[PDB]
Amino acid sequence: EIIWESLSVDVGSQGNPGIVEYKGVDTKTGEVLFEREPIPIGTNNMGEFLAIVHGLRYLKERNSRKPIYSNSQTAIKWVKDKKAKSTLVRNEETALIWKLVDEAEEWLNTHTYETPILKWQTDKWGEIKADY
RNA sequence: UCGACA
DNA sequence: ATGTCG
Ligand SMILES: [Mg+2]
Ligand SMILES: [Mg+2]
Prior knowledge:
By secondary structure, the chain is α/β, with parallel strands linked by helices. Helices cover 34% and strands 27% of the residues. The protein has one domain: Ribonuclease H-like superfamily/Ribonuclease H (Nucleotidyltransferase, domain 5), CATH 3.30.420. The chain has helices at 44-61, 73-81, 95-108, 122-125, and strands at residues 7-15, 18-26, 32-42, 68-70, 117-119. The chain has a five-stranded mixed beta sheet with strand order 3-2-1-4-5, with helices on one face. The structure holds a DNA/RNA duplex. One of its GO terms (molecular function) is RNA-DNA hybrid ribonuclease activity. It catalyses: Endonucleolytic cleavage to 5'-phosphomonoester. Its cofactor is Mn(2+); Mg(2+).
């Protein structure tokens, strides 16, 4: 069953690698709670990773125990491992996204959370509410 | 085989 | 339809 009292996050991109953005919404209503400014170059998985970590910080800051839904098996694992195993080359054009990823990893290594990170079951429930 | 992003 | 991220 769907846990309606939750935060759903999803990445959006134009090309992959390409322009990456992401947002978090109230799973029940669809209200947009946060939306990251487009990042010139990044991968889908880096964006999915950044979205979940942003969500963890967002909920922690607001003293919320709501779970987070993501449809990304890859990103869910990276967060659990506290390491984003991306293949994106490291250059001046990808410096911005790599800095954000490194900082998200560092946040995971300096904070604790009880937030359940759940797999959104697209095959059974349709597209995630944070879909672009 | 599967989860995603285009 | 054809690609890339995992
Ligand atoms: Mg997604
Ligand atoms: Mg989507």
